[PDB]
Amino acid sequence: ISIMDRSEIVARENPVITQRVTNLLQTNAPLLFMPIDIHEVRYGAYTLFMYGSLENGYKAEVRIENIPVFFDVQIEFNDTNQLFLKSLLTAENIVYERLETLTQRPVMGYREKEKEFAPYIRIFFKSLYERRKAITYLNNMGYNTAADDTTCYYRMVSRELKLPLTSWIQLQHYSYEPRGLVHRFSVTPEDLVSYQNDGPTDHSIVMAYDIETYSPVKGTVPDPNQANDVVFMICMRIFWIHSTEPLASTCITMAPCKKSSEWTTILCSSEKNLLLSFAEQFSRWAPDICTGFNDSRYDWPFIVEKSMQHGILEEIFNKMSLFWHQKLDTILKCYYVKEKRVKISAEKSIISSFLHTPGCLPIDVRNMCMQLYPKAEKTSLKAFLENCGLDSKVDLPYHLMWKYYETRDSEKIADVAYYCIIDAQRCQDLLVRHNVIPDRREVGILSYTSLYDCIYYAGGHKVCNMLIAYAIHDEYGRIACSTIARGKREHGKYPGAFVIDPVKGLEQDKPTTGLDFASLYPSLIMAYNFSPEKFVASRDEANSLMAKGESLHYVSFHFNNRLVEGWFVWHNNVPDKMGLYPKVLIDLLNKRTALKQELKKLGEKKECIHESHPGFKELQFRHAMVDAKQKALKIFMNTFYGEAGNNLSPFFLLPLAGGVTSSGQYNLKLVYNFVINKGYGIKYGDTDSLYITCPDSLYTEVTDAYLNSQKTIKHYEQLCHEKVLLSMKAMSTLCAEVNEYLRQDNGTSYLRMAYEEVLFPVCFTGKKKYYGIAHVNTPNFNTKELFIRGIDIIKQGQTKLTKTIGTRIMEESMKLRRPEDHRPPLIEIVKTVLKDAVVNMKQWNFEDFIQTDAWRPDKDNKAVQIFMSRMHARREQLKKHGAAASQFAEPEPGERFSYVIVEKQVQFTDSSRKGDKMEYVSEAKAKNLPIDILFYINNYVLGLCARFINENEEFQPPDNVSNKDEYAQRRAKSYLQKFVQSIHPK
DNA sequence: TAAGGTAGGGGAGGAT
DNA sequence: ATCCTCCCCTA
């Protein structure tokens, strides 16, 4: 049996480049290296430990020594300042290396052309702990501190040395030592160069592993805390960082397993032996990344707890950590990351617990997939595989494989091992198909962060790191930035974007085109030079700047019932005067513009090929991928705006965020006024998008054609066709004119309007609630899909009943109808559909009523809290009875669960609370609990339909009512309710 | 220990 | 029944 470790595997797979790499090693020649995992020694002399793959694929550890550990604080230039700081630090028993003095540009507040530079002193340390304690003491005492990354220092090293931690790096004049399977390199920052050009094929190793565990009690998830519960199988596979074919495969199991040519089978007699074999195989492979699906919630905690039970955590960790010898208490304290919070989206966070062995980066494929699909209803492996078009995994059922382990059948154990290997292969397929690792590497290169940051952290700190990286470069004059928020913070919301009260109702005659600002907030930042180093706060300083001829953008808004005013120095289209925020946003916008033009060409090449072509599907997928990429960039740039409005951010500037919002409102209103003055009608507005209709005169002559024909259905379809064409061309001309007007107004070309589609039949039901038929290049009314924004059918956790009713409403409203023919209003269509739904009740089955809700214990969502309080009481009652209550078990905090509303019999007590009516789908199907359909109707679809019908005059309030929309919505709700009781036989 | 922003619709439950 | 707060999710 040839148990090939990393070295022989690399030599076999890539022999020529392996020989070249070996020759370079003997000749001590510079060589390329891809880092993945970053580790730091915070105590004692600071050393940066990178782990990764050489050019051929050899595992390599790079130890960067003599890195300057430092942080700077701004104080006046005088010789006694150094001695005073010496005394201050020595009084706090803080050991430091040396003192330096320099000049840097503060990031906050505009300064004159000869006063950008302010004095700074740089404090050096041998250890990260001393630097951390000194930063804390100095900031508590009150000095302004910059370059003070405290939570971690590798980000500061990466941004300071211009050295991305996720890109190829060239090693020069290194100190080489081969030990075991690890080629250790001792280098210095001066001897270690970034390799940015034409990066070769990456040869990092990613192993996907899955575990199968056993519990004697049936129907329960095996608890690692339970002694009798055992992990009995581990299947693992190594792949290239870019390829889905397995370099090698290994299965470790309890029961005997028949030999399979697809993987190496390792047999163990005890759980301690199985864990030891897992550690041994991990050490022999020495992967650059260790990944699994839901491993940060199930696999890693199970393995760690079992190893603690067997008392072998120190041994297996030391074996997995290359040569990093750490004691058990240190392993539990630091390396076993427990209950780490990972932000998936807004108000959405998940838990992750894993053993971060040095030399390997842990990846949870579920975390990455949820980050890519933050609005995914189902977060299972099968759902994620289906979403991206990957092949369906042959599911291993529950009782089958627990029975198979019980029977000690060799071939059944082999089949379970095959399915576990398939699970690992699906993990790698998800990693590669979405290009997760290269995308995270690109993000790390852009933001000068490690891959670990790109995996387990959100983008706000990435925005801060990218800003500081762009700030510390001499071309910009060495802007000095802090990384931790300072100053008193307020609770509230500054004024945001402006939403135009929509002209509610269906439009079937005047085509409506959405014109959107391209990167509205970033474009405003570029145009008005919104940047903290270009910000003036005091009115007298602004007046003095006017006296010197400088153009300032003045903004004012009401925050916390007080007036916040500010002035921003305009760049005058001069690259020298361009701000830091505008510069970073120019770079990001150039990147996104390249991505957008590539996406546009790929969309125009995909539109000319019919979908049945074999090469279309994946190509279509590629299109989405590109879209996702630019979407990410968009979000990233928007984060900059948000990072100026977050009071917890180091770059927090309430005047800047308020100014961005006020400038967006002003520009939207300016374009609104200009478009209205040019005779075009406007239906709706949202932040930056304006929905504009051509004047009827522009459609006169073509209408005359339809007026001069016999007016068949195809005649009106054609008439709509050239109406949409005329729309497109008229909006193109109007967009050019509006862009020229904006250029004349603000003096820059950053603020540009853009046409994206035409919604000729379009219904606006309320603020952020509209839909229509989208025409991008040519009219196509035969598209079943509809451009939808804000309608309840797309809401997360919505019933299939609500989605079906809303889809019926919108598809009936979007139907093309000649003006001579009958044109039913939304009232009649909605009433007809609702009457069909209520009267023909049999059309709704059980699957149409499942809702989905997220269990957040810290959130007092009263309905679900009561529902699961009842479930906890029922579980207590069943355990008292001695029966199993796993079917009623509490879902783990954070995940979403499915439930239905049932008819709770009236026992004239029985509150009509939704909390007492929620039930899990499992027992509702099991016990055939009736579904309270009328509850569903009156509480979800009735309110949905009220939004559609709220535009009628009868529901309109008298002019004295301030909130016309809410009053109309409530009146429509009441009217539709009364209609329901009138039509429903009770 | 990390975690961009505000505007807004609408369900659930309780005060009242 | 009105109104209010909390919550979820979307814009």
Ligand SMILES: Nc1ccn([C@H]2C[C@H](O)[C@@H](COP(=O)(O)OP(=O)(O)OP(=O)(O)O)O2)c(=O)n1
């Ligand atoms: N997650 C988001 C999404 C949007 N916006 C704000 C910023 C945008 O500038 C403004 C405009 O909405 P868009 O969705 O159109 O975003 P952009 O205009 O910036 O880019 P693009 O026009 O390419 O969509 O909405 C935001 O702050 N945060």
Ligand SMILES: [Mg+2]
């Ligand atoms: Mg499995």
Ligand SMILES: [Mg+2]
């Ligand atoms: Mg826009």
